[PDB]
Amino acid sequence: MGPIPPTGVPVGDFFVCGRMTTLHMGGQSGIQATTLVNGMIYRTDHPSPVSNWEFTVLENNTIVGAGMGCVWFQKSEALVWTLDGQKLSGWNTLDGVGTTQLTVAWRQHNRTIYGWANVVAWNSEEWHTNAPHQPILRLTYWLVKINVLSEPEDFDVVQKSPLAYLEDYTTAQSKSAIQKLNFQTFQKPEGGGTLRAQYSTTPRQGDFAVIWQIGRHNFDMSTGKGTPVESLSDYVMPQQKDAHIGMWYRALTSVGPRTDVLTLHFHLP
Amino acid sequence: MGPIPPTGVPVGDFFVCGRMTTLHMGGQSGIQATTLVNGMIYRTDHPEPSTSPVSNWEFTVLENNTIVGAGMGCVWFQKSEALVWTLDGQKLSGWNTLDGVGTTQLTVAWRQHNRTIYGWANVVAWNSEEWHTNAQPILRLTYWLVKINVLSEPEDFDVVQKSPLAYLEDYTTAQSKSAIQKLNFQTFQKPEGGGTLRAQYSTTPRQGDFAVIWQIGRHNFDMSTGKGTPVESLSDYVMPQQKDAHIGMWYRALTSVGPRTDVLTLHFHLP
């Protein structure tokens, strides 16, 4: 027996495993941005309507989600498979996968690319937080297929990042809150309240990306539509989370390499 | 082809994808420890008397009663809930199981609060990846897949713990100046103080379960033998160039916070 080549589009809910490259790293002009992997562009001034984050998921002109992070990959290196229990039911490719009518708008430095990508599939997972009408914290991600080649300009902008909630802080030691997730502004060492979005290689037409948001929002697994996260602060998580969707460490780390391998799992409409 | 059941042990380098549970979360007596997933127990005082050399970290990898590595993190999983496969390029060369996988003679000693469990696990396979600093040994992330030999219930205890984070200056909880090229590791202490953090243990793996132990920091490692040096201590590091990594452990190893369990995708050189 020789090896099985990847063939056909996934039938039903599926897994994607690949090296996924962070769209931009957090920097300062003239300094290569090598570790700040979760700088999330946050812009409340606005120029279809857009969210407060870099990406906006749209049904026509209605915001149904936001993207505060983005990793991308080409179809050639991604592993794609489906399971029947523990049995392998398909060893597939993303070549020719269908898309939904949900679109993604990309807000760049001084322009917005509407129709930049279309949503293919998605996943989401909640983690109960202390609060009443407020949605609990959720991590939602969408697989998207890029429609157009757009080259983004690097620019300095307010960026939020996850971290532990630290008090009595020095670089050598701090008091770490036992139950908290924090999100704060990371500014560049020269100041200004902003951090440079230093873009790397960017997806082209037919490439794929995963965009995600984390924070208080609602989401409908059956349709891929929810609400955009409005803003980020600190959250108390009173119970353990034994999660399933595979994005949590990538979404919550303060530092990391620009690219690493991730396996994500996706639901179709 | 109809659906293929997992069949046979992996031959050659292989992948494992599954939900992996953090061995202990960073806490304080009486408070459920729900987010601090990278409290790494740091003890420079060697157990005395000791029948083997011991690292400064929770786990010591041993061969011929000599240190060949250390473990500062541990995630564990049951084999019945892991995907295991081998590749030839992008082609699938095996859809496998860890049932009946062979082990090496490299062992893992687990230093608990007041005892060390020798032979707690045997090494099955390993991987490692470097990331050059601006500097001595290179900064590396190294991990071993291990098969647990015994259920050894640990006692929760307060101890010095180090965690990764961004290098932050001019810090408040709302905003800080984040160094552009740095990784930092610092002591995280519980809010009640004392310089220590509680290791709050989860369910303990039993014989036949699997775990992944890893170390990050300056050390040497030989992919051909699975042996290297233990990381001695952790500080801050300047990374002058981008790292495009692939061993799948970097975000789990560098995050300051997270859920106790999530899916990870790792791959291993099998001796």
Author numbering:
A (entry chain C): 406 to 452, 457 to 540, 543 to 680
B (entry chain A): 406 to 540, 545 to 680
Paper passage:
The HAstV capsid precursor protein comprises several domains, including a highly basic amino terminus that binds to the RNA genome, a core domain that forms the icosahedral shell, a spike domain that forms dimeric protrusions, and an acidic domain with unknown function at the carboxy terminus. The HAstV-VA1 spike forms a dimer and shares a core beta-barrel structure with other astrovirus capsid spikes but is otherwise strikingly different, suggesting that HAstV-VA1 may utilize a different cell receptor, and an infection competition assay supports this hypothesis. The HAstV-VA1 spike structural domain forms a homodimer, with each protomer encompassing residues 408–684. Also similar to other HAstV spikes, the structural domain of each protomer of the HAstV-VA1 spike comprises a core antiparallel beta-barrel, formed by beta-strands 1, 9, 10, 16, and 18.
The HAstV-VA1neuro capsid spike structure provided a guide to generate a new construct encoding only the amino acids that form the HAstV-VA1 spike structural domain (residues 408–684), and this construct yielded a soluble protein in E. coli. We then used this strategy to generate a construct encoding the capsid spike structural domain from a gastrointestinal HAstV-VA1 (HAstV-VA1gastro) identified in 2008 in an individual with acute gastroenteritis. This recombinant HAstV-VA1gastro capsid spike protein forms a dimer in solution, consistent with other HAstV capsid spikes. The HAstV-VA1gastro capsid spike was then crystallized and its structure was solved to 1.46 Å resolution. Structural alignment of the experimentally-determined HAstV-VA1 spike crystal structure with the Alphafold2 predicted model using TM-align revealed an RMSD of 2.90 Å across 264 residue pairs and a TM-score of 0.85, revealing a relatively accurate match in the beta-strand and alpha-helical regions and significant differences in the loop regions. Finally, to evaluate if there are structural changes in the spike that drive infection of the CNS, we aligned the HAstV-VA1gastro and HAstV-VA1neuro spike structures, which resulted in an RMSD of 0.78 Å and TM-score of 0.97, revealing that no major structural differences are observed. We observed that the HAstV-VA1gastro spike sequence is generally more conserved than the HAstV-VA1neuro spike sequence. Specifically, only six variable sites were observed in HAstV-VA1gastro spike sequences, whereas 27 variable sites were observed in HAstV-VA1neuro spike sequences. Statistical analyses confirm that there is a significant decrease in antibody binding to the HAstV-VA1neuro spike compared to the HAstV-VA1gastro spike. While these results are not entirely surprising given that the antibodies were raised against a gastrointestinal HAstV-VA1 strain, they do demonstrate that antibodies to a gastrointestinal HAstV-VA1 virus are less reactive to neuronal HAstV-VA1 spike compared to gastrointestinal HAstV-VA1 spike.
